[PDB]
Write a protein that binds this DNA or RNA. Sequence first.
RNA 1: AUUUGACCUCAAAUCAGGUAGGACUACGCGCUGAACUCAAUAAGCGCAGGAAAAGAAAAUAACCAUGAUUCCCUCAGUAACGGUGAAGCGGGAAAAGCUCAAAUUUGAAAUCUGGCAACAUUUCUUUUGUUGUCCGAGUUGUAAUUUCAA
RNA 2: AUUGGAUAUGCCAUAUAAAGCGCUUUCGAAGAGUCGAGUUGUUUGCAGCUCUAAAUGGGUGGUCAUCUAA
RNA 3: GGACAUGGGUUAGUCGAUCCUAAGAGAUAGGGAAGCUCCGUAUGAAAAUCGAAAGGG
RNA 4: CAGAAGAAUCAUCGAAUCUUUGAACGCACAUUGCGCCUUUGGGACCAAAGGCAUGCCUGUUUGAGUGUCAU
Lengths: 75, 49, 114, 182, 121, 166, 23
Amino acid sequence: MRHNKSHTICRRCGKRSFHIQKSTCACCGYPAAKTRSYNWGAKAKRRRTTGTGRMSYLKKVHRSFKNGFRSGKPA
Amino acid sequence: PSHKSFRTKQKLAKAARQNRPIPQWIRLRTGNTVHYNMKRRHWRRTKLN
Amino acid sequence: STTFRRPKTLQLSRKPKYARKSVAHAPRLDEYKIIVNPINSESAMKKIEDDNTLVFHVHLKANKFTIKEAVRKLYSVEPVKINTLIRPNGTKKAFVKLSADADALDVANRIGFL
Amino acid sequence: KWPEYIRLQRRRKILNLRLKVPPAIAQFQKTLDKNTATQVFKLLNKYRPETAAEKKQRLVAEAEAVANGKVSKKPYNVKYGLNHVVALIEAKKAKLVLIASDVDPIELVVFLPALCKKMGVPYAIVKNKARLGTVIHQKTAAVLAVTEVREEDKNELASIVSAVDANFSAKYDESRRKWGGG
Amino acid sequence: ALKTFELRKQSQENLAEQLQELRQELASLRVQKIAGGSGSKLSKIKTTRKDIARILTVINESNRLAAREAYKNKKYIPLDLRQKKTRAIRRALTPYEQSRKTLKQIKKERYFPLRKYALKA
Amino acid sequence: GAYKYLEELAKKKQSDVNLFLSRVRAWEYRQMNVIHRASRPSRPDKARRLGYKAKQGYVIYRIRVRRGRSARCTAEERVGRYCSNLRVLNSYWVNQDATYKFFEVILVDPSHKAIRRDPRINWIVNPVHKHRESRGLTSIGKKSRGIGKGHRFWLRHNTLSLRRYR
Amino acid sequence: DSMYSDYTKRKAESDVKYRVKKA
RNA sequence: AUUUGACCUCAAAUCAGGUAGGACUACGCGCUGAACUCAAUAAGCGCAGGAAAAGAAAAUAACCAUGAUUCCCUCAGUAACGGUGAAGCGGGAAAAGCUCAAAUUUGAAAUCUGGCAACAUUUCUUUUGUUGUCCGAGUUGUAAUUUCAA
RNA sequence: AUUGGAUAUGCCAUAUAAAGCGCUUUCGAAGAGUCGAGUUGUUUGCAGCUCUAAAUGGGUGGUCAUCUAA
RNA sequence: GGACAUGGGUUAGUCGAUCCUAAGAGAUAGGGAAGCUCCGUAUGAAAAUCGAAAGGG
RNA sequence: CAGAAGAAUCAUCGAAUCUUUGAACGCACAUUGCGCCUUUGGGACCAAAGGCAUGCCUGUUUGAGUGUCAU
Ligand SMILES: [Zn+2]
């Protein structure tokens, strides 16, 4: 008798938390523009905060900053 | 079922690759604690959800 | 005397002072990426000499027109039918049935995977 | 049904002609007569300020004259700008005052008729700010003031001042204390 | 592998043809891997992949320098050719307009600037 | 200068002329939108003394807010949110009726070169002035939060400072 | 005048919905 | 008749050029705000920066007077209120002052964005400007002088 | 390889100008639904609402002293 | 052995989805709210979309 | 391990690439669903490249107005 789904995979956050009838993710709040976050969920914030991913651009910016954001080609 | 979507199939595809045995040569490397699989799932056991 | 609709103003096209991208991007779906590898499993090998057909592992973005153009530009062999499926591991496998003029064995020999 | 912008465009007009207008505003929709207005603008056409091109030509001409071998005549033009005109009224240097009848914020011109009368300056309300704008090579001129002309134009300047007196001060002279509108 | 500098002293079409034959060779190398090849071929797969990457790199560089030459000394250039430090630095005030001063302040700094003085002990 | 006359007339808000103009203008803004552009300010004297110059970069928006928090502060916040590329310079009351108070908000375009090259307004381009109307750094914002100089106008108590040597 | 009279006539039925209190 | 040209208002454009969103949030500024003085706390909402905010008195004082703001010791657990709880002065850390509106350049809008063409300059072919020309903004006021210490 | 500021040195600038100082035989413009009052709400301060200012005036402290808000 | 290890296996113009819409959800123009946002979707505008692998095809 | 042999799973890092998404931006997305504009290529069709979100600001163009006017 348990062969129906309440939530599905979320497009934005890739978890099975996107409700079907309400059409809003319980985890990240998609389709809301702002990502769902609550200060009482300190652990919930640190599971999805920055640094849990690749941070590909931020590492690029940090190495760039350490040299004063120079451009061009050396001698 | 036999009516799955593409996204469901693709998620199934990598979930089938994840639960495969580890090659022996990577175990034989030095400083490599990897000697078994701790992400081994079985279909009758825990569901993918 | 009714339906005061908008007057028709001319629609000036875009006249940019600069292109939004400095250089154009080369075609991202070329025949080399379309045809990845051929399958040489025994079932495919049977199809080779029992149906004048070659089994290719194609890119997952490829559509029947594209493999048709890709094999034609990479082998100059004229296909008659293409059938595509997606394997359970998430890879597209294409059965290209050639015309009776070409021989699947000769094509397989010249590719080098018989 | 007409768009809301043109509905409000017509509705503002009807209400302005419908409501009880205090005399300080009621004095504005009574303006100068036709022929006097044409003679006003005929006189001001002579004394319109020099254009930017004419100014630049004069500036380069005097600059090269000074540079090569070497002071000009007294300029004669109409005086524009609200503050500059108000200053001229304060100093009594202005001889004739023209106020556009359709200034958008009416408080910008509501105090002028009282001020010119206090200084005894001949003032008149003329039609449309656009005409004053073309006179001074502008889009909009809220007020114009004539303070000095050439000697040969003094005779007819006195005549038009008498004419505007007759058609604006001898005539009317009651709308400034009459509850207009309604 | 091909040296990047001698790749630079060639023309566009030659790099295009070298690219095309490299892709033929890579396709041949991969089918050898599928059908069973020697360790030399399996190792040659990586080096030929890197050499196509070199040719793509030099082609893209030559195109971008060409575009920079085309847009040299122009008010507006493509957003790819424009600088990218940060969004904040791009939106910030330039040093010229941070140094802009009213004529009042110019006179003040002309006539009463920070003087150079000292005290005798 | 006529702005002295404009200012002195604005003092007397119960005058017959001001009452007639206010009713007609307030009626006009009613069938206008809640927030609408005003190409030229309705009180040029007030706008100039509040910091508005008739140059490319300054924007005047008229907003109506119902009565019954500070209406001037609410007007600034709503206009600032509605024009997100503009810094709210200041605002001033223009009109009122039984239920609607009308305000005109002066905004500045930080991206415009006529603003970025003017040393007398360049301070607003700095990123520290983003959404001043929301942080409470405007004139009505400062007055509402009670910022002032004098005995009339918390963290120093809820902490117990423990020095090294004690 | 005719437009406003028509406006009132339609508002009498179509745009009634005044009832300005929604909790 | 009606055609022609202005100004005002309002539109439309895949028009030219720009800008806002979202994320982090320890510190910063606001709105809002409980319950078991709790607490202007926690939660909720908005918005920034490297600091934020505050800041050059519509300030203290009743002295031989002090002199922008911020922080620290002290005042002091005092005044005050009915357990809450300052501030002036004094000693230090740091110091820096200023800008507009309100008056006519009226013998001259002297002001400014943008388009076009050159000249340049660069953390940089990626940056920032200069001049000339055109259009526009602008007299419903942009420049210079003035901010009460004057 | 960059620069940050000064020193020496070269070249342009255009001052027919601008500014500081002592006197007046002079005038001295100064921010409004804002201050303020009554009432209700929040922890004097702030806000809602009725009403609504002045120009040696207005605010603050016990005629005087000190400041000059919006 | 359905467990473990190594491989192979799902081929569509005609079968379905995709198309349409029902109950319903909801963008937009406007109106509120200190605000995240609620009403509004045929509505006083210078003109939708989603929703059925058992419905229609 | 095999393998060839300016090497390297080296460091630095100013030149580039950066797939599908996501504030996410042609419309949608429990769908590898549905489009439109420009150009090019292929032997009507297909393919490829470049584009099409919203609000706001400055300017440009076209308008709309029995709104005010001048002939
Ligand atoms: Zn999610």
